[PDB]
Structure formats: C-alpha cells, structure tokens
C-alpha cells in the first residue's frame, strides 16, 4: 500500500516523483544560489541560500553553483540542501515513510555512491534505498531489454550496451562531454557576434538560447557553406532585458561538438564514433541486435535532428548489409525517470533494496555488493 | 499568482484559514486594476490594505509561536527569514496606507497601484511562510514542543502537485 | 515467431487458452507494423498492450499457483525465473503504455514499435513459461500437490515436434 520514491539527481535538473507513476511530479534545476550583494533593506537579508526555481527566478543577485559537475558530487553541503528541498519543500512527503531510488552515472567514484547512501540513511532516515545505473533504466523506459544506451545528460555522456538482461561492463564508454560543455562552447562562440555572457547568471540565458534555437545539421560542411550566403539560417532571440540577438552559424556549431569534440580541444571521439567503437568492443554474435536497437535518453539528445545525423554517421562506419535504427522516443528527456518509476514499482524488486537493518551492521560498504 | 498555490480546504484552523482570507482579499484587491470588483474609490483599498496588514501581523504572531520549538537551522532559519519579510511588508503597508489616506483627504490610480504591489509582495511572503511552516511542523512531529501545538500533517491540505508535462 | 510454437487446441482450460489469446493478440498487434489489420491509430495499440499486461498478470498468478507444489530445483527454478521475466515484462508494458497515451493526448510510428518489442519479449517469456509449467506439471504428477490442481498430461496439447530434415 506504500509507494516508493524515485529521485533522479541529475547534473542540471533534479527530477523526482512516486513509483508506479507516468511523469515526475517535481522537476527543477539543481542550482544553489548564494546572494552576493549588500542587502540594504533590513528584512530580506536573512535568507542565506536559495535552491531550485526560487533561485532560477532571482538569478540576477545570486552566485549560482551546481553541486554536481560531470556526474560526481563536489559539494555535499549543497547536495543535502537540494535533497531537503526535493523531499519536503516540493514533493511534500516524509522520507521515513517511503523507500527511495537514486540515480548514478556508471564508472563514477565509489566515494560518491558511499557518501550518497550515507547521507540518505543517517540524515533522512529512509526505510530502504537503492542506487541504479543511469543508462539501464532507459531501457526500462523504452520497453526493451536489448540495445545500447546513449545517455547524454548535462554532466556526462555514457554508452552502455545491454543484451537481454545482461550488460557488458567492459564496454561501458563514458565521455565527459555533455550539455554543460556545449553551453560553455556556446558562450565562447557567441563572442564573435559581439555578445558577451560572462557571469554565471548568463549561463542560464545561453542555456535557454541552446534550448530554443540550436539544431544539428545532417551534413556539416555544406550547411556551413550556406551560412556564408547568410539568407535563411539567422534567427532572432529576445533576451530578458529586451535586446534581440541574431544567430547564424552558431545555431549549428554548438551541437556539432557532440560529433567533433576537437572543437573544444577534447581528445576523444564524437558520440557517433564512440558508439561504433563501443559496439565493436562487444562480441560478434550480439552485434546485430545492438546495431538495430539504439535508444537515446538524456536531454542532450533532444536537439532537432540528432537521430538523423546519428543514423547517417553510424551507417558510414557500420557494415552496409544490415540496418541501423536510432530509436528516439519523444519523451526521452524524462526517460531516466520513467524507468525509475518502473523498476521501483516492480513486484519482483522488493527483496533487492538496501534496508536500514542491512546497512548498520555492514557500514556504507554494503552498496557496492548490492548494486553493481 | 497564488490561486494555483492556494489549493486548500478550511482545515489547518489557525494558519491556512487566514491565508485563504488574505488570498481572497488579494484576489478582490487586484481586481480593482481591472476595475470590475467591489472596490470603487481608493479609500476601500486603504481599508483592504489595513485588513491585510492586521492579518499579516497575526500570521507573524502564529509564525513566531511555531518557530520557538523548531530545534536547529535547517528550516527554522528559512522560517525566520520569511517572518522578517512578512513583518517588513505588513509594517510598510500599515503606514503607507496612512500617507495615501492623508493625501486623499487633502486633495489617482497609481496611488492604488503602490499598495497593490505591496500587497502582492506580502502575499508572496505569506505563501512562502505557509510552506515553510508546513515543512517545519511535519519535519519535527516526533520532536518535543511540536506535539503540544497539535498540528498534524493530515490537518494541512497540501496535495501532491500536478504531473509535469513530458512533451511541450 | 511463436505461431509455429502455438500448435494447441482449446484444452488446458486455464493456461493454454489465455496463451492462445495472447498469441492471437500479438499476431494482430504486430500486423500494425505491416498495417493491414484492425489497428488504425495508436490508442488501440495502448488498449491491446493493456490487455496483454492484464493477461500476463493473470498468467503470473497461475504460474505462481503451480509453482508452490513443485518440490525442488530442477524445473522449479526455471519456472520461477520465467515468472520473474513475465512479471517484469508485464509491469513494464503496463506503465509504458501510460506515458505513450499521455504523449498521445498532449500532442508517431516508433511509439507503437516500442510497445511492439515489449509485447514480443512478453510473448517469448510466456511461451517459455508455458513450456516450463508443462515440464513441472507432467514431471511430478505422482507427487502430492500436483494431483489437486488436476492438470494431466493428456490435457496439454503438445504433440511431438517435426521430423528434422536429414539432408539440407
Ligand atoms: N531540447 C533541448 N535542446 C537543447 N538542450 C536541451 C534540450 N532538452 C534538454 N536540454 C539540456 O539537457 C539538460 C536536461 O537535463 P538532463 O541532463 O537530461 O538531466 P540529467 O542530468 O538527469 O541527464 C538541460 O540542462 C538542458 O541544458
Ligand atoms: Mg544526468
């Protein structure tokens, strides 16, 4: 009769809700803001920190910090503030009545998961908790059990190949290029238009620019060439102040970092080439099913036209005798949440939590021999 | 824009009911900017602002009563900050109404608009401290001092929020 | 590809009949990918997936009923494994249909294809647990507990398989 709580603590958007549901009830950016000015009024000077949407509304007077950068957690005193805002202030449930399910990118440091379950037990007193891999839940949300997962969140971009039940942990390819690096490259590439976005409160504005304008070209060279004859690729976006900005080739040079990471100096391969590189790390028998089942979770795979370029860029690398199907579900931004609503509400799961009586005798090291 | 936040019932019996009174008097106060409510001149807006000032002082009293028994920082500092905000807003509204009344009886739309903006900030502060007092009460219900005030989590009429749209 | 596996009659009377219902609703469901059956929009695919989810939950119930009286590991562990597979598939289909319905009523072919693949995996799991339940029932027919369920080997309509081709 009790329900389970699920909380995808992403790098840019904390999503949370109840198990068995079909949509997250709370979604808010995981920002902690400190005020940085004097505060001359005698009231409204005691509020020392702001979290979530009330920091997103007041971002002009706050230094903004994400506690999660590239999947790992660098500030625990802000992460417990964000979780305390998540459970009480927006979900309005007590943690002691519901078991909780958290989300972790693969190949993370063990100290991150250890301090995460220690904070979840010895501060909020949950009955039971479970941390799951951020990519294995995307296959639950897609309805499948085979396929490789290209989860490109805000912090990290990881490819996990999973045949029917069984993952292949020697082929989990985690690349540190994601939406925050595209946001910083859009800050760097909008300087050539004349616009200077320097503070951390303008990162939100250029993130909104990336939201509503940036698409990815099917072919990059000729689309770059037609931007020289600047006639139809410019687009105007209105700022919060009122000034309009015009954007030309910067509209599609920003997602092209996903397929050419040498633009920001990263010695790596693009997300089309590490996918074929990661399928080739697998065995030759399951390679047919992994080529034909390519799910894409994460918000950074919500650019207009990333499925077409992903298919076109794999099919020049794969052998040309069997098809590639980049299956891109339309709700994929919340996809990591949706599988979290499945696995927590599944009937055969309830003897695979981490109970509090199992934690206090074995310490926080119980989370490694239970989850992965 | 707190009518979507003011989804409650007549329960709570000390905090929620005056919050609903302040919400309906804001909803009838800011209708004067559209000009189709029961407010005609400017002096009834002064009486309305005096009503919200007295109700905000009473809410400040009740918020001070709940804040004595909260043990430490985690929500008590937030509650004290919103209490200082609602105290500043109500005390500014109180003797900002007086100067507008004395301007009225010694000699015409923006005069209402300043009190409207003050009431809007007061209402945002009061729904913020309603949320903070809910968190502070249902966080520490086993703690001693909270149990004597007799405010269980059932008495608050806060439901779970809406399903967020997955697409668009 | 279980039509060659679904060579039965209307006997069995608890397990085989809903298996044939699930087989014919898969055969009408995956015809929508060819697009010449009685399925036109995507919402009837949602109702079909809800039908197979309810039938898979009923099959999980019956499989749990037969699995109590099987004595030890040899087929009971296989039956429990396929029961956990069919439980995962049906529960994933159940609330994967809801998000596709809410995407449908808030704003178009791959949306069907994900549920098609989930139903295909569900059907493979259900024919696997039909075979495992047949083995577990006709293995231990003299054992106590099996005889009360009243499922003899004659009631199953599994014939011997085809002659394998000797050449080519
Ligand atoms: N349609 C879109 N276009 C561009 N960027 C997007 C889009 N949708 C989401 N994003 C980016 O992806 C992020 C969404 O959060 P996400 O990274 O998916 O959460 P998580 O950290 O759990 O993966 C946002 O910060 C935003 O920058
Ligand atoms: Mg993430």
């Amino acid at each position: 009769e009790t329900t389970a709580l699920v909380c995808d603590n992403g790098s840019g958007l904390v999503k949370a809700g109840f198990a068995g549901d079909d949509a997250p009830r709370a979604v808010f950016p995981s920002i902690v803001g400190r005020p940085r000015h004097q505060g001359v009024m005698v009231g409204m000077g005691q509020k020392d920190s702001y979290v979530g949407d009330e920091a997103q509304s007041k971002r002009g007077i706050l230094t903004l910090k994400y506690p999660i950068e590239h999947g790992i957690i660098t500030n625990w005193d802000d992460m417990e503030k964000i979780w305390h805002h998540t459970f009480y202030n927006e979900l309005r449930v007590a943690p002691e009545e519901h078991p909780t399910l958290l989300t972790e990118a693969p190949l993370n440091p063990k100290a991150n998961r250890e301090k995460m379950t220690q904070i979840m037990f010895e501060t909020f007193n949950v009955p039971a908790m479970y941390v799951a891999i951020q990519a294995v839940l995307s296959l639950y949300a897609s309805g499948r059990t085979t396929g490789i997962v290209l989860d490109s969140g805000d912090g990290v971009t990881h490819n996990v190949p999973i045949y029917e039940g069984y993952a292949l942990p020697h082929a989990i390819m985690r690349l540190d290029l994601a939406g925050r690096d595209l946001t910083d490259y859009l800050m760097k590439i909008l300087t050539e238009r004349g616009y200077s976005f320097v503070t951390t409160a303008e990162r939100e504005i250029v993130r909104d620019i990336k939201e509503k304008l940036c698409y990815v070209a099917l072919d990059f060279e000729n689309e770059m060439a037609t931007a020289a004859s600047s006639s139809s690729l410019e687009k105007s976006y209105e700022l919060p102040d009122g000034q309009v900005i015009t954007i030309g080739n910067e509209r599609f040079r920003c997602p092209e970092t996903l397929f050419q990471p040498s633009f920001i100096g990263m010695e790596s391969a693009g997300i089309h080439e590490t996918t074929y590189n990661s399928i080739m790390k697998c065995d030759i028998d399951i390679r047919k099913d992994l080529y034909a089942n390519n799910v894409m979770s994460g918000g950074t795979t919500m650019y207009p036209g990333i499925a077409d370029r992903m298919q076109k860029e794999i099919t020049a690398l794969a052998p040309s005798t069997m098809k590639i199907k980049i299956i891109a579900p339309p709700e994929r931004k919340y996809s990591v949440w949706i599988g979290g609503s499945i696995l927590a509400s599944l009937s055969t799961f309830q003897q695979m939590w981490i109970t509090k009586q199992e934690y206090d005798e074995a310490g926080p090291s119980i989370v490694h021999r239970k989850c992965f | 824009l707190d009518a979507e936040v003011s989804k409650w019932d007549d329960s709570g019996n000390d905090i929620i009911v005056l919050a609903k009174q302040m919400c309906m008097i804001m909803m009838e106060m800011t209708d004067f900017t559209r000009g189709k409510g029961p407010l005609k001149n400017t002096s009834d807006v002064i009486s309305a602002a005096k009503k919200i000032a007295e109700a905000g002082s009473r809410m400040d009293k009740l918020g001070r009563t709940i804040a004595d028994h909260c043990p430490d920082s985690a929500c008590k500092q937030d509650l004290l900050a919103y209490l200082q905000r609602i105290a500043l807003y109500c005390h500014q509204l109180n003797i900002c109404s007086k100067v507008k009344a004395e301007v009225q009886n010694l000699g015409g739309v923006d005069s209402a608009m300043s009190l409207i903006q003050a009431a809007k900030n007061l209402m945002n502060a009061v729904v913020q401290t309603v949320k903070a007092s809910y968190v502070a009460s249902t966080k520490y219900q086993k703690s001693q001092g909270m149990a004597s005030l007799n405010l269980p989590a059932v008495s608050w009429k806060m439901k779970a929020p809406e399903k967020k749209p997955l697409v668009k």
Side-chain angles (χ1 to χ4, degrees), chain A residues 8-12 134 151 153-155:
Chain A
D8 169 44
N9 42 359
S11 300
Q134 199 157 326
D151 171 273
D154 202 341

Side-chain angles (χ1 to χ4, degrees), chain A residues 89-107:
Chain A
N89 265 289
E90 200 139 33
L91 273 184
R92 310 190 193 100
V93 297
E96 301 101 356
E97 322 286 334
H98 300 258
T100 179
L101 168 80
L102 309 175
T103 302
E104 173 202 64
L107 276 159

Side-chain angles (χ1 to χ4, degrees), chain A residues 99-372:
Chain A
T100 179
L101 168 80
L102 309 175
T103 302
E104 173 202 64
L107 276 159
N108 269 329
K110 296 193 163 198
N112 169 49
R113 185 178 334 135
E114 262 181 6
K115 291 176 189 179
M116 178 184 298
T117 173
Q118 172 171 331
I119 283 303
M120 201 46 67
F121 277 138
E122 298 193 313
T123 303
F124 299 145
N125 305 144
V126 291
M129 68 100 62
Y130 190 59
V131 281
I133 303 309
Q134 199 157 326
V136 304
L137 298 153
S138 172
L139 275 164
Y140 284 110
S142 147
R144 283 208 208 82
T145 63
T146 42
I148 100 166
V149 183
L150 191 131
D151 171 273
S152 67
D154 202 341
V156 294
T157 295
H158 44 116
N159 278 23
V160 176
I162 292 152
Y163 190 83
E164 36 198 12
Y166 296 90
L168 286 96
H170 66 277
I172 299 178
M173 212 75 66
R174 169 187 179 184
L175 158 75
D176 285 300
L177 173 130
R180 185 159 304 168
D181 299 338
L182 309 192
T183 300
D184 277 16
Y185 185 54
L186 195 53
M187 286 170 65
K188 186 185 179 295
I189 211 63
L190 276 174
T191 346
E192 298 171 327
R193 275 305 178 173
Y195 317 123
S196 86
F197 295 143
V198 66
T199 70
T200 183
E202 276 84 298
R203 214 177 306 271
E204 289 319 314
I205 322 290
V206 79
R207 186 164 65 87
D208 201 359
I209 290 168
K210 213 173 59 60
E211 293 291 333
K212 311 204 180 319
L213 271 72
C214 291
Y215 79 109
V216 48
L218 191 145
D219 184 318
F220 181 56
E221 294 74 27
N222 47 16
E223 188 66 63
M224 176 67 82
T226 64
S229 86
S230 319
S231 65
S232 73
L233 268 301
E234 331 60 303
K235 191 171 283 293
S236 308
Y237 172 88
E238 72 298 340
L239 274 146
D241 71 1
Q243 286 173 348
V244 301
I245 55 174
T246 71
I247 285 184
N249 52 3
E250 298 94 31
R251 196 181 165 193
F252 59 91
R253 277 192 286 172
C254 168
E256 199 62 32
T257 310
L258 297 166
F259 305 96
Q260 276 193 196
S262 81
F263 280 173
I264 63 154
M266 276 273 304
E267 177 47 89
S268 228
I271 75 174
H272 69 89
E273 193 162 2
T274 170
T275 278
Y276 167 73
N277 185 35
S278 157
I279 296 171
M280 286 308 213
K281 299 291 312 275
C282 293
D283 315 316
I284 189 144
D285 309 33
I286 69 174
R287 192 159 283 159
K288 222 186 167 259
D289 303 295
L290 288 185
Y291 273 149
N293 272 327
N294 273 339
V295 287
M296 277 198 314
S297 84
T300 319
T301 53
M302 278 212 70
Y303 287 112
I306 195 167
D308 293 330
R309 193 191 166 85
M310 269 298 307
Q311 184 173 1
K312 180 235 171 183
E313 268 312 45
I314 289 175
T315 195
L317 278 173
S320 55
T321 177
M322 44 73 50
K323 41 168 216 108
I324 312 294
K325 186 177 75 191
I326 312 293
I327 173 81
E331 70 278 70
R332 56 183 169 266
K333 180 171 65 170
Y334 302 100
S335 213
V336 179
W337 192 91
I338 297 298
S341 161
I342 296 189
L343 177 127
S345 75
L346 181 46
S347 56
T348 180
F349 187 48
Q350 323 305 325
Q351 316 275 96
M352 206 183 335
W353 295 98
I354 304 148
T355 49
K356 192 171 173 19
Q357 66 183 358
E358 253 187 277
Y359 158 72
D360 43 30
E361 58 90 19
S365 84
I366 198 72
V367 74
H368 314 268
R369 52 199 192 228
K370 195 57 58 85
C371 309
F372 208 68

